[PDB]
Symmetry: C2
Subunit: 197 residues, 2 copies
Amino acid sequence: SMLERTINLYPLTNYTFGTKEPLYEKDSSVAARFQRMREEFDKIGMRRTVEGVLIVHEHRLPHVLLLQLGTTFFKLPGGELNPGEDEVEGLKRLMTEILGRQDGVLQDWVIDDCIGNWWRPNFEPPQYPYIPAHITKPKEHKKLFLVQLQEKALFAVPKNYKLVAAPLFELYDNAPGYGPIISSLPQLLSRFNFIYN
Amino acid sequence: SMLERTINLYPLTNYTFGTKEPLYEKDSSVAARFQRMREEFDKIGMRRTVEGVLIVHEHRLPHVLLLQLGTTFFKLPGGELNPGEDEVEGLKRLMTEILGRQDGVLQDWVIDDCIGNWWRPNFEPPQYPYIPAHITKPKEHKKLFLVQLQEKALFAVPKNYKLVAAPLFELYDNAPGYGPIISSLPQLLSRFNFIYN
Ligand SMILES: C[C@@]1(Cc2cn(-c3ccccc3)nn2)NC(=O)CC1=O
Ligand SMILES: C[C@@]1(Cc2cn(-c3ccccc3)nn2)NC(=O)CC1=O
Ligand SMILES: [Zn+2]
Ligand SMILES: [Zn+2]
Ligand SMILES: [Zn+2]
Ligand SMILES: [Zn+2]
């Protein structure tokens, strides 16, 4: 009856958060964001994005690491794949670009579990955990993965972002605060057997 | 990068829904339900419940089988474990009790995946996908499993219930209609690679 995946969690104090240069968004506004999505869709079709869920604990309470753009939006570490790029190799590349060290030592990213899929039917904000009715050409497909951290690590956070450890209760039923993907992480993580090391 | 579990789905017209005698609830009201939960907690501690998610398709659109008590509440097939009872053997027993055949031929239930965990902190309706802060003695633990159906089957539905195939869009963000567990099935199912046979 042990059908659950077992995942090792480590204290937040096991991890060192250094700083490095700002990492600027491609798009300077929502309007530019949807213009670029439309231009690239006509060239190379559906956008493929990947996002990593990194979990720690303090005193046996799990927390998800989120990246806050100044004091505005909360984001998962991740981003856009290149055409023909493998999903796992691409998430590892993107997580190195975002949290990789100034001294250029490699993190050992371990990615073994898909935890969800979201689809964007139009060049507009709405996203769903399925392809909606009558939609033959979705504009974006987003894939979420659970990233198993090592016991200790040094991460370099771009100076324009703050790394924040969010407890699950703060995410739960808070789409206004976090939107529909991050707010449903508590439900998506409930199947795992966490070990509090 | 194929980290997803692959699941075979079959058309709803592949399945025959017969009828059998009513199957009556132990508790004739919410108030009796929480009285029995309190009496049993003092004798044998935390209630352990198990629930099965059974998926079909029509024209390549997935649907979850729900059991409607007349025209009131929607339920997953499942129920309460006995003390010392294995979770998987118990869900198989409960699904036979509910949907098992009048002719007494065994269904071949295949249960290979946990899809979530919910906890009830008090003798009250609220349930969460984690144990809330300061709660040392939760009153109920509910475990959800994905049940892989065979290509064809005959199910006997108790005359007091109706079997309904709900498309995912109807569940999504509809807790008033379905409550917080069934309404989050779209998110919990998004990680699977469904084959539409
Ligand atoms: C190509 C790339 C790479 C990229 C990802 N991020 C980022 C994502 C999460 C957290 C912090 C930073 N910043 N640039 N540039 C964009 O504007 C979107 C995108 O995918
Ligand atoms: C012991 C038992 C068994 C049981 C389960 N169900 C049922 C569950 C889902 C759908 C249709 C029927 N009806 N009786 N009696 C109760 O009143 C709760 C319980 O667990
Ligand atoms: Zn401690
Ligand atoms: Zn897709
Ligand atoms: Zn068809
Ligand atoms: Zn428990």
